[PDB]
Amino acid sequence: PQAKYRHDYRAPDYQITDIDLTFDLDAQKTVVTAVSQAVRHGASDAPLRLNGEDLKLVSVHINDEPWTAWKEEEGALVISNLPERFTLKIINEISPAANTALEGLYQSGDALCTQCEAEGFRHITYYLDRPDVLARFTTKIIADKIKYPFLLSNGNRVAQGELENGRHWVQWQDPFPKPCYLFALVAGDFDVLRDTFTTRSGREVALELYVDRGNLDRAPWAMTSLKNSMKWDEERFGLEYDLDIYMIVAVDFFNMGAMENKGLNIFNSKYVLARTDTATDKDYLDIERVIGHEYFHNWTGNRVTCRDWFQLSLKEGLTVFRDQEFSSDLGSRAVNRINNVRTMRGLQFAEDASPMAHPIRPDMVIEMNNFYTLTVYEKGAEVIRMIHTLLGEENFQKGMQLYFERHDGSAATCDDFVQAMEDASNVDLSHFRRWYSQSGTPIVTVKDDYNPETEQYTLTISQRTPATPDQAEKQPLHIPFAIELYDNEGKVIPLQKGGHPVNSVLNVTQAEQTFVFDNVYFQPVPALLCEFSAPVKLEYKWSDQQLTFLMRHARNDFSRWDAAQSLLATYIKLNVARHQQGQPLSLPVHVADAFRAVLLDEKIDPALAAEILTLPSVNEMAELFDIIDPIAIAEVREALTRTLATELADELLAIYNANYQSEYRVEHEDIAKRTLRNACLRFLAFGETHLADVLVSKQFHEANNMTDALAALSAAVAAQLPCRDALMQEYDDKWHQNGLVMDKWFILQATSPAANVLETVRGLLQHRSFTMSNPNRIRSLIGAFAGSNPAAFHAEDGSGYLFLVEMLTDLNSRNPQVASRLIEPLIRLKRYDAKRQEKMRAALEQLKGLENLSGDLYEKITKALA
Numbered sequence: 098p099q100a101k102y103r104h105d106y107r108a109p110d111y112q113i114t115d116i117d118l119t120f121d122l123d124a125q126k127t128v129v130t131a132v133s134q135a136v137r138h139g140a141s142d143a144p145l146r147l148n149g150e151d152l153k154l155v156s157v158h159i160n161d162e163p164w165t166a167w168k169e170e171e172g173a174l175v176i177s178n179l180p181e182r183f184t185l186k187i188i189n190e191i192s193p194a195a196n197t198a199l200e201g202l203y204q205s206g207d208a209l210c211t212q213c214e215a216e217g218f219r220h221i222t223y224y225l226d227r228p229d230v231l232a233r234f235t236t237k238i239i240a241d242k243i244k245y246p247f248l249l250s251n252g253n254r255v256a257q258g259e260l261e262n263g264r265h266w267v268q269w270q271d272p273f274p275k276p277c278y279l280f281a282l283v284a285g286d287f288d289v290l291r292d293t294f295t296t297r298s299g300r301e302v303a304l305e306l307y308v309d310r311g312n313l314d315r316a317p318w319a320m321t322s323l324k325n326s327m328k329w330d331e332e333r334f335g336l337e338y339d340l341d342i343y344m345i346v347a348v349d350f351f352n353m354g355a356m357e358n359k360g361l362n363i364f365n366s367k368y369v370l371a372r373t374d375t376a377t378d379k380d381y382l383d384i385e386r387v388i389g390h391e392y393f394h395n396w397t398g399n400r401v402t403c404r405d406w407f408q409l410s411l412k413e414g415l416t417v418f419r420d421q422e423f424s425s426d427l428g429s430r431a432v433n434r435i436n437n438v439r440t441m442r443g444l445q446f447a448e449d450a451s452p453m454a455h456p457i458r459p460d461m462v463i464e465m466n467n468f469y470t471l472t473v474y475e476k477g478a479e480v481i482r483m484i485h486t487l488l489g490e491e492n493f494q495k496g497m498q499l500y501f502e503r504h505d506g507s508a509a510t511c512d513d514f515v516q517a518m519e520d521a522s523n524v525d526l527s528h529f530r531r532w533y534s535q536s537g538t539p540i541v542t543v544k545d546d547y548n549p550e551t552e553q554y555t556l557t558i559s560q561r562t563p564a565t566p567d568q569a570e571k572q573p574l575h576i577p578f579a580i581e582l583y584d585n586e587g588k589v590i591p592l593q594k595g596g597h598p599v600n601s602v603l604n605v606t607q608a609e610q611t612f613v614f615d616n617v618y619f620q621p622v623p624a625l626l627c628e629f630s631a632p633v634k635l636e637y638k639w640s641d642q643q644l645t646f647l648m649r650h651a652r653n654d655f656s657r658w659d660a661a662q663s664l665l666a667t668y669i670k671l672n673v674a675r676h677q678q679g680q681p682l683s684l685p686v687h688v689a690d691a692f693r694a695v696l697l698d699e700k701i702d703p704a705l706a707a708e709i710l711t712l713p714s715v716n717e718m719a720e721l722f723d724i725i726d727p728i729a730i731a732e733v734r735e736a737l738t739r740t741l742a743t744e745l746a747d748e749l750l751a752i753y754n755a756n757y758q759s760e761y762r763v764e765h766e767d768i769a770k771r772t773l774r775n776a777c778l779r780f781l782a783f784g785e786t787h788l789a790d791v792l793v794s795k796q797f798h799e800a801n802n803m804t805d806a807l808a809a810l811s812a813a814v815a816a817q818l819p820c821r822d823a824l825m826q827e828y829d830d831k832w833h834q835n836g837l838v839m840d841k842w843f844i845l846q847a848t849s850p851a852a853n854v855l856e857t858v859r860g861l862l863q864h865r866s867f868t869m870s871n872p873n874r875i876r877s878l879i880g881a882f883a884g885s886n887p888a889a890f891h892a893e894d895g896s897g898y899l900f901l902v903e904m905l906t907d908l909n910s911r912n913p914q915v916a917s918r919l920i921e922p923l924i925r926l927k928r929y930d931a932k933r934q935e936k937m938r939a940a941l942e943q944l945k946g947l948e949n950l951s952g953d954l955y956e957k958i959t960k961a962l963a
């Protein structure tokens with residue numbers, strides 16, 4: 098399998114302007130007829146090269162003439178000797194029931210549905226499967242009326258009929274030209290939740306949510322979120338929906354979260370279905386985010402699409418930024434920002450230090466489905482947020498307006514977007530563009546000096562990005578570096594120099610530079626990299642007292658959390674080193690005191706308190722170390738939880754009780770209180786055993802919502818409490834028929850600290866609720882073990898690696914996309930000690946030798962073994 102390169106992009110020799118599709122649908126054999134209107138742009142002697150994968154070609158006609166001047170090659174149908182304008186007709190067969198990979202046209206339970214992004218449409222017919230070819234689609238679907246009473250595609254229904262032998266048909270038309278990755282088809286039997294939204298200018302939109310029969314009770318929150326998303330995009334971005342119907346279909350078998358097909362989004366049911374007894378606060382908020390996300394793509398991805406797949410972040414970074422702004426505006430902006438920062442520092446930084454490191458606009462790709470990444474999405478969004486920081490809201494919106502004005506109805510590039518922002522705002526983004534081309538995490542080092550004689554404070558800021566495996570050459574970036582200076586009373590010191598105010602977003606553009614501020618009347622405590630203003634590691638030699646001072650006084654809640662993170666990082670690193678020497682946890686009294694104060698502060702927002710009281714995950718902890726010791730990190734996390742539970746026991750119980758709520762509401766103030774209460778509960782579970790067991794068992798039994806039940810169950814597992822086995826059985830007995838709810842329980846099994854966790858996980862491959870055919874089940878059991886239980890995964894005997902090899906051996910052939918997601922923990926081997934590296938390398942070498950190794954795994958394995 099061959100790498101493709103961004104610098105090799107060239108405009109297509111042929112365009113397709115209009116395609117008429119007919120599907121004679123059947124699970125075993127579907128017949129596709131595709132009539133395309135084509136136009137030659139290249140030389141008269143260039144052939145038309147159509148992509149196709151696993152298609153049985155039936156016939157090829159050019160203007161209704163059976164064509165002889167063609168050949169099939171690996172992945173292609175190459176058609177020679179064509180006129181300048183012509184009608185291409187292809188008939189071909191495919192087999193939905195054989196499609197275990199879930200790319201193209203496949204079966205999800207009894208429904209048929211599609212996934213075409215990135216290069217899945219070529220699994221349906223021979224086409225110009227590239228996103229710079231936009232065509233007007235009409236889609237006629239013919240099927241068994243009893244099995245498939247609903248036949249859906251993009252746009253509006255234009256024709257319908259009934260046939261003999263119990264078949265019927267529906268034809269759809271979408272007036273907006275689209276790349277084929279935005280094509281969708283759905284056939285099946287559903288319950289349909291129907292609603293309407295009226296746009297600001299008066300366009301009436303029919304909203305239709307299709308769910309499996311029996312699930313209408315779980316649909317209203319997703320419908321509500323859709324209306325919320327539509328309203329927000331109008332208020333914040335000035336964007337309205339552009340069609341007459343908005344269809345969402347919830348399917349149980351899906352490789353990612355959801356997909357923005359124009360007017361017909363297809364969602365993993367995990368990001369649709371919610372009831373208060375089945376879904377947690379986090380599930381509700383994730384539904385909200387993902388509903389929003391797909392909706393936001395209607396403009397940022399559909400009305401303006403991607404020229405080529407190396408431009409993926411053009412739509413993904415921007416749409417993730419939008420979904421974060423949506424969540425943040427409707428909910429707690431501080432909690433959103435906190436959680437997105439946790440993702441960046443703990444999951445994305447790790448990728449940027451891995452063999453799979455890439456810039457947000459990649460230069461080289463073997464399998465494009467490997468580049469739907471934390472980098473492209475989350476780091477992408479941080480890049481867009483840097484633009485927002487540099488420009489301000491008003492100029493940023495002017496940029497958005499110019500981007501759409503120039504590019505509406507076309508496929509564009511990352512560079513076009515940056516250019517729109519620069520031209521609308523008059524801010525120079527030439528240097529800033531380097532964020533698109535350079536991989537790896539920059540390290541920003543800050544040193545300070547206060548001069549009492551001149552009342553001047555000097556910051557000396559330096560930047561470096563370490564080389565990555567993809568790029569030996571690194572240069573300085575344009576780093577927006579936001580600061581605030583605090584006096585001894587906690588008040589903000591105005592930033593100024595030579596009698597003029599200085600913007601608090603410093604432009605850090607050199608390897609090293611100095612910034613000098615005047616009229617600094619007291620030695621400052623700085624808040625540095627405010628609201629994580631660039632996606633960088635900060636190196637500043639904080640005292641513990643500066644950090645606890647910021648925890649009390651900083652004016653943005655984010656900085657209060659972030660200071661607590663920096664305080665904890667010191668003592669996490671201490672205690673991991675101690676663990677490796679056989680010594681127990683050591684923590685200064687004044688550190689415990691700082692967290693006590695958070696618990697007892699009656700003015701602090703409980704949302705903020707809850708996050709300060711949520712310890713960094715084992716993933717975020719790992720990023721503090723050059724060499725990861727996953728057992729020490731897991732044990733230190735536990736010991737720190739135990740020590741805090743003991744030291745703060747009375748305060749924890751008092752806050753736990755004070756935040757009791759009898760009514761359950763999916764409302765932000767209530768969510769915050771409950772997050773704080775359950776954060777207290779987690780510590781209390783690790784206190785004295787009898788009280789822990791009683792508190793946790795009683796919460797599990799008395800809970801009137803899954804947030805509270807699951808928090809108790811999760812605490813019983815984590816603390817290995819006496820009640821654990823009974824509670825886990827109770828949950829299985831009640832919920833085994835419900836896969837989404839059982840996912841939570843598989844995660845708890847997979848992430849258990851028990852010594853026999855791997856044995857239990859293997860045994861669960863036979864559980865009544867588990868199946869290797871379902872990506873959600875795979876991810877919740879196997880993925881969670883490998884990715885979220887690094888202590889067990891990285892068991893010194895190598896057993897975790899062997900288990901993953903066995904699962905990947907099946908998944909490589911069944912569902913390579915899922916396989917490639919699951920291999921990620923093994924490609925991190927160079928972060929581990931020599932003995933672990935050796936075992937992980939041997940595991941990778943076994944996988945490299947697989948017969949029929951997928952391109953998906955090949956890419957990652959060869960980068961890892963290099």
Ligand SMILES: N[C@H](CC(=O)O)Cc1ccccc1
Pocket residue numbers: 212214215352353354355356357390391394413469
């Ligand atoms: N654009 C889709 C998701 C999203 O970012 O909206 C990407 C996707 C790729 C592969 C399978 C499913 C979905």
Ligand code: NA
Pocket residue numbers: 160183184
């Ligand atoms: Na013709």
Ligand code: NA
Pocket residue numbers: 112113114229230231232
């Ligand atoms: Na076109």
Ligand code: NA
Pocket residue numbers: none
């Ligand atoms: Na009708």
Ligand code: NA
Pocket residue numbers: 424425426427428429430
């Ligand atoms: Na808000």
Ligand code: NA
Pocket residue numbers: 464466952
């Ligand atoms: Na593929």
Ligand code: NA
Pocket residue numbers: 862863864865866867868
């Ligand atoms: Na099973």
Ligand SMILES: [Zn+2]
Pocket residue numbers: 390394412413416417
């Ligand atoms: Zn997206």
